[PDB]
Amino acid sequence: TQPLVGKQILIVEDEQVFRSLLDSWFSSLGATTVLAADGVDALELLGGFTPDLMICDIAMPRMNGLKLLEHIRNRGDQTPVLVISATENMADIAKALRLGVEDVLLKPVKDLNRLREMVFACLYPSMFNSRVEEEERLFRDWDAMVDNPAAAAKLLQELQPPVQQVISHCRVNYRQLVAADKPGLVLDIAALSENDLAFYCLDVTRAGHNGVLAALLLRALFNGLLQEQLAHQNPELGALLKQVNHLLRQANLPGQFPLLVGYYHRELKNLILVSAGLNATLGEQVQISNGVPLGTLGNAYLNQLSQRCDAWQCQIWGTGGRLRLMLS
Amino acid sequence: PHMKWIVIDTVIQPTCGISFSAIWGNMKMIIWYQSTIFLPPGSIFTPVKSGIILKDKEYPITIYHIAPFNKDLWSLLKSS
């Protein structure tokens, strides 16, 4: 066949029979294979030519295959390296995984089809993101009966901010009237600086347990993410919403995620707000746009607003809760 | 026989009380679990129904989320 046409593949194996087996398998698929029997020979071959994919065995090499991985990463080539080991040297498998390796195979060669799967997934990751899609489905079903949504819901309820607090020398109060202790509308307020404050509001009743997870993930990273978008500046909340959509996508958190994101600068007396899913209003009154919840539409691509006030009163409500937020 | 899964790395968020661990079993996975159990990188363990046998001791592990590994999400976790 002709799948691996023009695919330079390096095989660093020390047992001759396994060398021949791997080379015959790769050449049967049309790959241009280079074989080494020694770790130093491996290092030389690497200095010489760049293989599209590499296979290394840390089992009885002249130089530890894990040390060859260490060298490759120290050079920053970051070339793919599929490793071969056995049920032994579990720690070596760990060390390889900490290195930029792709997968692992047991020393016996029985499941060749899984080898084809892994090799193709590595060589054309975009084409074979079918694996990622299938795994997403599998883990969505898997999570249902291994995870404890009750514990996550309780943790989210426990982590909610105090009712009244001063952040960035801004007075801040919030009061929710929907049934509490059943996590619905959820808020987080963080200080981005001595003058910048930010917050997010999510109705976790729409995504279910995933929503709770999303909320938790937000409280872990929202600050960070916003700071990153503030790194490349002298705002732009919408990019933060899209990045949050992509975060929930990277984690296996499907469903609808109605969100609101706000940012107040005290010295600039400015509040900026964007909504994708959640209703809200806030004064000089302005009703925030409903928007399309995250995890849907691909990209909400919604608007912002600047009122240029010192104190504000914004009520935020969705199908799962109603809340008030106040800054004085 | 017993499954021998290995913790590739782990991140703990003080903002929350969560431990995120990238682990290898037959494939790479990200687990969001309760911080109470501490799984340093390189730890080898056997999974069990709502539990983990490590060093011949069965710890009750509270799992929040199980997902396939994501390089981007894990790098984001490690940057906090």
Automatic annotation (TrEMBL), chain B:
Its main location: cytoplasm. Coiled coil: none annotated. Transmembrane segments: none annotated. GO terms for cellular component: cytoplasm. GO terms for biological process: cellular response to starvation. Keywords: Cytoplasm, Stress response. It is found in: Cytoplasm. Belongs to the IraM/RssC family. Inhibits RpoS proteolysis by regulating RssB activity, thereby increasing the stability of the sigma stress factor RpoS during magnesium starvation. This is Anti-adapter protein IraM. It comes from Escherichia coli. The gene is iraM. The chain holds residues 1 to 78 of 107 of the full protein.
